[PDB]
Amino acid sequence: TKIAMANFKSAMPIFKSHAYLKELEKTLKPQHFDRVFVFPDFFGLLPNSFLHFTLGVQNAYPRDCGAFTGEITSKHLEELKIHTLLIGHSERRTLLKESPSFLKEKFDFFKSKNFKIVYCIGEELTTREKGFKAVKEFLSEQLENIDLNYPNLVVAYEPIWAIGTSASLEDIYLTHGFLKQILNQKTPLLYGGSVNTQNAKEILGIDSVDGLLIGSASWELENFKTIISFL
Amino acid sequence: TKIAMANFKSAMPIFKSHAYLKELEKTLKPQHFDRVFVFPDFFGLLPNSFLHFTLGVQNAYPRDCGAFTGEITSKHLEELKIHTLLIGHSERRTLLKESPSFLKEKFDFFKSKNFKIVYCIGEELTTREKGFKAVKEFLSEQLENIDLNYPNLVVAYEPIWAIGTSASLEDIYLTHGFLKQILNQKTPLLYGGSVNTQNAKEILGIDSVDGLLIGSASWELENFKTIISFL
Ligand SMILES: O=C(CCC1CCCCC1)N(CCO)C[C@H](O)[C@H](O)[C@H](O)[C@H](O)CO
Numbered sequence: 098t099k100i101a102m103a104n105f106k107s108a109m110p111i112f113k114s115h116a117y118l119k120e121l122e123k124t125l126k127p128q129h130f131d132r133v134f135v136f137p138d139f140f141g142l143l144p145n146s147f148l149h150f151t152l153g154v155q156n157a158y159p160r161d162c163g164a165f166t167g168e169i170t171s172k173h174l175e176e177l178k179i180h181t182l183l184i185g186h187s188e189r190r191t192l193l194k195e196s197p198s199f200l201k202e203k204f205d206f207f208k209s210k211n212f213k214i215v216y217c218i219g220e221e222l223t224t225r226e227k228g229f230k231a232v233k234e235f236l237s238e239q240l241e242n243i244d245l246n247y248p249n250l251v252v253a254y255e256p257i258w259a260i261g262t263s264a265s266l267e268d269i270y271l272t273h274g275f276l277k278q279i280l281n282q283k284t285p286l287l288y289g290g291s292v293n294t295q296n297a298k299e300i301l302g303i304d305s306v307d308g309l310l311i312g313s314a315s316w317e318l319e320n321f322k323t324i325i326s327f328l
Numbered sequence: 329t330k331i332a333m334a335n336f337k338s339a340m341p342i343f344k345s346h347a348y349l350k351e352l353e354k355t356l357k358p359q360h361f362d363r364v365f366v367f368p369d370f371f372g373l374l375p376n377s378f379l380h381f382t383l384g385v386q387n388a389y390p391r392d393c394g395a396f397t398g399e400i401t402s403k404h405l406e407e408l409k410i411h412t413l414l415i416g417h418s419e420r421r422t423l424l425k426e427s428p429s430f431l432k433e434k435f436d437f438f439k440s441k442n443f444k445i446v447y448c449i450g451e452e453l454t455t456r457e458k459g460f461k462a463v464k465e466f467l468s469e470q471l472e473n474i475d476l477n478y479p480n481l482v483v484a485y486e487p488i489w490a491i492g493t494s495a496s497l498e499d500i501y502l503t504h505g506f507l508k509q510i511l512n513q514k515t516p517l518l519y520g521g522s523v524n525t526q527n528a529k530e531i532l533g534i535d536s537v538d539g540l541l542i543g544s545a546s547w548e549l550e551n552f553k554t555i556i557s558f559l
Pocket residue numbers: 225226258259262263264265266268296
């Protein structure tokens with residue numbers, strides 16, 4: 098089976114998120130544990146007692162604990178038994194200005210904690226429009242920031258122009274084909290960006306697509322359930 | 329002189345924070361409601377049903393909800409019935425790179441929702457080195473960034489060089505004295521930066537000090553309760 102990950106972003110009400118988790122846990126079985134992932138916000142999550150899917154957080158500060166006002170640190174996550182994290186999502190790079198150095202600080206830190214890391218990359222439409230060389234250069238430069246051989250690494254390719262809008266199959270086939278040349282053959286490579294119940298199955302048909310990172314469409318349990326069925 | 333606020337930052341275990349809030353509620357009375365403040369991290373807080381102290385958050389993104397990976401938004405706080413927030417704390421300005429325009433965005437957004445705002449300001453040691461005229465000009469520019477007449481505003485003067493180590497009574501008397509010359513007369517002006525059970529009473533003795541923003545020293549409930557008796 099392939100991968101399916103839900104990114105709640107900051108769109109799910111606290112109560113709705115909590116029920117979502119409990120329901121999902123009842124609908125899924127043990128074999129979905131390492132196939133399905135859910136990333137709710139700090140309020141929407143719950144202690145990690147789930148055995149049918151993987152619980153992760155959308156962000157964290159790269160320190161055990163301390164004077165980091167407004168931030169969540171690793172000891173807290175350890176207390177919640179969460180050990181999966183998103184890093185470099187486009188929204189944080191742009192709206193919250195997380196530079197490459199900061200993202201590298203996070204990767205190195207959480208890697209040292211043996212976390213499963215879903216590292217996000219993606220180019221702007223302008224880069225896409227400059228040609229193949231421009232996209233290859235941009236993406237390969239983003240991957241230089243991390244350790245591509247860390248076995249608990251997952252790379253999520255989300256073209257920025259497709260987040261919250263969807264990349265064409267031709268686009269996904271060629272881009273992922275290139276990425277597969279740069280990444281460890283064991284690293285799962287997910288496609289993200291406007292994935293929905295309508296285009297999921299097709300996206301999943303590309304051999305260089307090991308899974309999906311679903312934002313908007315996953316905020317409805319049933320939609321996610323349906324996507325899971327295509328895995 | 330009458331207000332005490334606790335900033336848990338990212339230093340308190342989840343279970344401890346929860347127990348802290350419940351115990352504080354049992355200890356204090358209704359008279360402490362608008363005099364005592366507690367700001368736990370996102371995990372350490374609980375639904376706001378507290379009547380003996382005010383519950384607040386250390387940060388939030390200026391939107392009702394949406395595609396903001398890693399952020400907590402307005403609607404989330406409404407569910408928890410939280411309408412008190414910290415903005416501009418030094419740790420976020422530097423470590424998280426929150427610019428003045430970003431802080432202003434947060435201020436204007438939560439202003440519209442009648443949130444009680446605790447706007448933090450404080451100069452670097454380098455600035456203090458130059459001279460009082462240097463700090464006065466630096467502080468002015470920081471205050472230049474918001475609406476000083478906002479009825480639910482609270483300003484917290486916190487010398488960056490005194491965070492996590494305390495400013496002399498002399499520098500507090502002078503710097504607050506200056507701040508009282510541009511701030512609205514009714515705006516509570518707090519002092520923060522290495523406030524502890526040992527210097528609490530004296531700081532509070534200064535007329536231009538309306539309260540304290542307590543960090544590391546508040547992590548131990550008994551320390552917080554002691555400082556409360558000085559109000
Ligand atoms: O093809 C593209 C973008 C491709 C790039 C290629 C490089 C030059 C700029 C253009 N889009 C972008 C639109 O976001 C169209 C969508 O792939 C289709 O509209 C979608 O697959 C279909 O409607 C599903 O039923």
